[PDB]
């Protein structure tokens, strides 16, 4: 028990900075970061769906949630990555 996002953070770290490492304390911050953004996006999508009397959170909700939460440029890229991962998942 006591799962975290460490492994995943670290893997993403090696893609953008193979050379770079990361202290424990710094890893704790990435964890906190991921949990926070996860809850905000999640939270907003929840409300969105409720506002429209829907019982299911789809990528449609997640996207609008990203649009409402992330600032301008960061929102664009997030929406890109998002639709890209969903697009590749449905295919194969």
């Amino acid at each position: 028990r006591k799962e975290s996002y460490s492994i995943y953070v670290y893997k993403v770290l090696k893609q953008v900075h193979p050379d770079t490492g990361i202290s424990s304390k710094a890893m704790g911050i990435m964890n906190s970061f991921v949990n926070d953004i996860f809850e905000r996006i999640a939270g907003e999508a929840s409300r969105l769906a409720h506002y429209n009397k829907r019982s299911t959170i789809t990528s449609r909700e997640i996207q609008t949630a990203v649009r409402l939460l992330l600032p301008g440029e960061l929102a664009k890229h997030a929406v890109s990555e998002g639709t890209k991962a969903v697009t590749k998942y449905t295919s194969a």
Binding site: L13, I37, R54, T58, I62, A85
Partner: protein, 104 residues
């Protein structure tokens, strides 16, 4: 054959799903929602790691610390807005001294 690899992500799609279901957000959850969400979490993570990576390099360090994440965030307009109500432990503040307070 896991969903993350299928969506081609480093982040745990299957877990993001189990979390969405158990977080009491909605009665039902789409199949692409966890995928989508997982993709967003990874991107933002890369963004910070990238900038914090540089902040480290620009300081002669190889290993990223809290300071480096704080410098990466505060020195970036968008990341800073997104986390303007968040406090990174052990990150300190950006050096900045009001002009009026300078000598002569």
């Amino acid at each position: 054959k896991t969903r993350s690899s299928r969506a081609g992500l480093q982040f745990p799609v299957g877990r993001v799903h189990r979390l969405l279901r158990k977080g009491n957000y909605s009665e039902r959850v789409g199949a692409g929602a966890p995928v989508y969400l997982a993709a967003v979490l990874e991107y933002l993570t890369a963004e910070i790691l990238e900038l914090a990576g540089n902040a480290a390099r620009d300081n002669k360090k190889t290993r990223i610390i809290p300071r480096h994440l704080q410098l990466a965030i505060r020195n970036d307009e968008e990341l800073n807005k997104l986390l303007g109500r968040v406090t990174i432990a052990q990150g300190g503040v950006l050096p900045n001294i009001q002009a009026v307070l300078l000598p002569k």
